[PDB]
């Protein structure tokens, strides 16, 4: 069955596909943004608005792959086998969690009805071929 | 029957040709926008706007020529025959459906008057010879 | 995505294969029907009913897909391959536009309540064994 | 930071250590229960309760680690060093997703306050020495 | 014990015996009539009037004998043994389900108090010997 | 079409797969319970509840497949090819009528909402590994 991780939040996964793979910051940049201005709300025993429930279930999922990124780096005899698994987590699977950590940080800081009105105005900018588009990308702010 | 598929909406086939042939983004990109934020409306047994009824008949018309592109690549032995039909559907016909899907996937998102006033305010940008043009072409945002 | 082009109108694509494949009159005999009764309402700048908008996107889809049957009569010098495309347009794809045009050109001359009772009352009339049924087939009344 | 996976939902990871490493059913058998009872809940665009939102991120992280258990099978060369990664996803990581899927199925059907009643009433069963321990271990009932 | 499949619906099995074995259409004709104009009501999780409960328990029973009509056609070594079982299902057992599928289609389309006032007026026509009866059989309509 | 046999009555065929293929009693033993308690119900011309109407079509399809298990015994010649049809009615088809008669006996006596409580509370018994599974399997009580 499909799940579509963004389906309850207004967006889908086809709408988040238009963001190119350098619009997201690195993974240690996104975890430290949640480790700076939401640590009072994430660890609290009351759950806030349903981004906070989806966000603390997404950091721990990346927190488990950091164990798999370390256990592979120790308990494999081949240095050629060790390089493919560690690079696969930080390139392909990591790019999925660069989307998922970004969307729940940007909806807690700027609201839900602004990022959903930003991915439309970015979805009309990136489809336009480079000869006919403004050179300044639309920036995210309130 | 000099039937114009835009005359019911305000634009013509002659007004939409201000945009050049390579401005329209590719066919897989637009069908990943109709399946991004209109999947709930196109499936439902109720036409919301007359743009939905033209758009619902526009994907299935492309759904036939995609079926004919698959069929012409399996039940023909001759590769010189096979490489001309597929290069005709995706290039010489597929410029008409990129014009038609763009006028219904960017009009439900931004209204009718804004797109109909976008093609005039793009028309005074592309005619100006390449010396005295602004660096930013107009694009429609929310 | 799974779009049947009739789900708005009450019928499905299953209820229109419930009539036999021989009942539907020929394709060139319905474009000569639309262009005789309802010709000044298709080219009108206003859309009267949502049957008109679905019909105007259904002629031009056939007006395009017939041009692909003409284009392969000049740029395909192979009678082993030229006949198979035209016998695919006129037979396999041509069965769907022979009944998509019939559900719109024979609805707005009789209403929508009359045809959706006719597709059942003739649809159950054929399966009846020969002489236990009213001896003539029903037809539409204005 | 120290995100406790259950702190919003009553229990903690210290309380859930009463259950041994053999009480949990296998991951290939809960997902035939998270899809048999509940399919209309975790497809719909509305979240009913925060057990539904925490279940989707818990069912898609297994959706990534099943892809990684397949990707290693077709790209990693050494068959003796390929088994050691596949037997890490099913054994050591999967014991945390046997744990996380079980808590959001048994709370989702039996309520939250019955599982928190159950985790205590299993903890006064596993510690009793076997000379005086009843063979009827406690299980759930709606 | 007797069950008399029609006993709760006003009729009996002696009253339905007078219909000769060509008044019923073929089995693929009766299933497609229920697959045309009642598919919205049969698969719905609410049960309608008690014909709908008896009808969807009668299609599945025929849906299981189509498995027995296929499994016999594969896993028997004798082509003489294979012919008797396949013909017995389509002649003798099939004639029972041509009655049962017809009576619940004709009561949903025309009411219960019309088919029960039709089998009487057919039960007086078929008993009359052919020299003294009208040549036109009584037809079923509202 | 896809008629789900239980969709009107709460459960589905995916939910009823929790019960293994050995939990159901034999067909020759439920019909001595569908005739011991209930004889005045399923003879009478009034249907009390839709469990009664769905039981008669479920008790007469076995009434046809018992006739087919007798008809093959007296007409089919090969005694090695006769056992293979008789051991298909009792084994593979009968496992669906052990299934269908059980759900309309246990719901008919214990109510609908107790069996749907029972199918869940058996599903949290069959999956628990045998080191921690109680020997008292759940059974019904009025």
UniProtKB/Swiss-Prot annotation, chains A, B, C, D, E, F:
Phosphorylated by host SRPK1, SRPK2, and maybe protein kinase C or GAPDH. Phosphorylation is critical for pregenomic RNA packaging. Protein kinase C phosphorylation is stimulated by HBx protein and may play a role in transport of the viral genome to the nucleus at the late step during the viral replication cycle. This is Capsid protein. Self assembles to form an icosahedral capsid. Most capsids appear to be large particles with an icosahedral symmetry of T=4 and consist of 240 copies of capsid protein, though a fraction forms smaller T=3 particles consisting of 180 capsid proteins. Entering capsids are transported along microtubules to the nucleus. Phosphorylation of the capsid is thought to induce exposure of nuclear localization signal in the C-terminal portion of the capsid protein that allows binding to the nuclear pore complex via the importin (karyopherin-) alpha and beta. The keyword Hydrolase does not apply. Its main location: virion. Changing residue 97 to L: Enhances capsid assembly. It comes from the Viruses. One of its GO terms (biological process) is symbiont entry into host cell. The chain holds residues 1 to 142 of 183 of the full protein. GO terms for cellular component: host cell; host cell cytoplasm; T=4 icosahedral viral capsid. Keywords: Capsid protein, Cytoplasmic inwards viral transport, DNA-binding, Host cytoplasm, Host-virus interaction, Microtubular inwards viral transport, Phosphoprotein, Repeat, RNA-binding, T=4 icosahedral capsid protein, Viral penetration into host nucleus, Virion, Virus entry into host cell. Homodimerizes, then multimerizes. Interacts with cytosol exposed regions of viral L glycoprotein present in the reticulum-to-Golgi compartment. Interacts with human FLNB. Phosphorylated form interacts with host importin alpha; this interaction depends on the exposure of the NLS, which itself depends upon genome maturation and/or phosphorylation of the capsid protein. Interacts with host NUP153. It is found in: Virion; Host cytoplasm. Belongs to the orthohepadnavirus core antigen family. The lineage of its organism: Viruses, Riboviria, Pararnavirae, Artverviricota, Revtraviricetes. GO terms for molecular function: DNA binding; identical protein binding; RNA binding; structural molecule activity.
């Amino acid at each position: 069955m499909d799940i579509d991780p963004y389906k309850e939040f207004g967006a889908t996964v086809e709408l988040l596909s238009f963001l190119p793979s350098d619009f997201f910051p690195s993974v240690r940049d996104l975890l430290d943004t949640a480790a700076a201005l939401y640590r009072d709300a994430l660890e609290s025993p009351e759950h806030c608005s349903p981004h906070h429930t989806a966000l603390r279930q997404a950091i721990l999922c990346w927190g488990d792959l950091m164990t798999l990124a370390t256990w592979v780096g120790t308990n494999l005899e081949d240095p050629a086998s060790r390089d493919l698994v560690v690079s696969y987590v930080n390139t392909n699977v990591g790019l999925k969690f660069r989307q998922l950590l970004w969307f729940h940080i940007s909806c807690l800081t700027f609201g839900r009805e602004t990022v959903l009105e930003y991915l439309v105005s970015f979805g009309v900018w990136i489809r336009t071929p480079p000869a006919y588009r403004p050179p300044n990308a639309p920036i995210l702010s309130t």
